[PDB]
Amino acid sequence: MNYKISELMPNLSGTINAEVVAAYPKKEFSRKDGTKGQLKSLFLKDDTGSIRGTLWNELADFEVKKGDIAEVSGYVKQGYSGLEISVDNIGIIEKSLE
């Protein structure tokens, strides 16, 4: 079940396909529980709508460029900026190797 940005509902863990409209530098803080945690700010858009993306921990180091096609798996909910998607898995579809 591949979701669109319009199919995203609060407390929904799912995977979507969208374009990276904005890519912001990572951030490094400490979780309330004591363990270290990273944070990276992103923006995604699709024909069905647009959403604000959020990478945690090692995912905040992941290379994501403005204009690249990415498939983002995350936990969407209501709260930050109205609706935030806490990314669980992220990958750039256009990637390749030797």
TrEMBL record:
UniProt domain OB: residue ranges: 32-92
Highest taxon of the lineage: Archaea
Protein name (record): Replication protein A
Gene source species: Methanococcus maripaludis (strain DSM 14266 / JCM 13030 / NBRC 101832 / S2 / LL)
Gene expressing this chain: rpa
Portion of the full-length sequence here: 173 to 267 of 642
